[PDB]
């Protein structure tokens with residue numbers, strides 16, 4: 156039985172290596188990674204890989220790994236796929252922990268924009284969780300943390316992390332992680348997956364996919380929102396992505412909103428993530 160070596164980048168930045176039979180389905184590898192991570196609430200997570208166009212793709216757990224990575228390396232990342240709107244409802248602290256690690260990368264990467272004060276508050280909770288109580292012996296007036304907190308670090312932000320860390324004395328890691336999540340879950344881009352697109356007049360927009368529905372960003376002014384219940388059918392064809400939008404009470408007919416994606420694979424990827432979000436958040 157021939158086995159392929161898999162390398163998975165974990166949310167702490169470490170590399171997990173394992174082997175699976177070369178005709179394995181994605182679920183096989185994902186089960187090995189989740190066991191390694193002692194993760195039981197696996198439904199919120201998945202593995203990503205980079206396709207021949209260098210686009211992030213979700214590894215479909217029901218399909219052969221080889222028919223997805225195709226010509227590429229068996230290299231993956233472990234990631235949050237479905238961001239829970241209320242992380243307090245998760246059953247296990249360790250689940251909340253992995254969600255914190257993902258969110259920390261969302262913030263540092265700039266995928267999750269955040270005010271100065273919220274960057275410092277989230278950072279202060281991370282430090283409390285990881286180092287415990289504020290120790291002056293560690294930090295002087297020139298302190299810079301090893302922790303990456305933000306897309307652009309400033310001395311002012313380091314100072315504010317320390318000021319807020321001082322306020323958290325006696326806070327346990329689970330408690331600090333829950334506070335982290337209570338703040339992060341409120342940010343306008345929390346759990347929003349952004350896709351570049353053009354509207355039916357060729358005007359560049361972003362489509363965001365999240366728990367509450369599909370968001371259309373025309374810019375920072377005029378954001379259209381389609382709650383999952385107002386969406387009846389999602390489809391792609393060639394480079395085009397279509398959603399059916401319900402008739403408003405006493406309306407005879409659904410409306411169609413069409414988008415142009417960069418290429419056919421980008422349209423299909425957007426369709427699959429929308430269908431998965433629609434299903435997941437219909438049941439939550």
Ligand SMILES: CCOC(=O)C1CCN(c2cnccn2)CC1
Pocket residue numbers: 264265266267268344349361372374
């Ligand atoms: C370096 C990665 O940066 C991002 O993902 C940001 C995310 C936020 N943002 C938005 C927000 N709404 C509509 C359109 N774009 C700019 C791109």
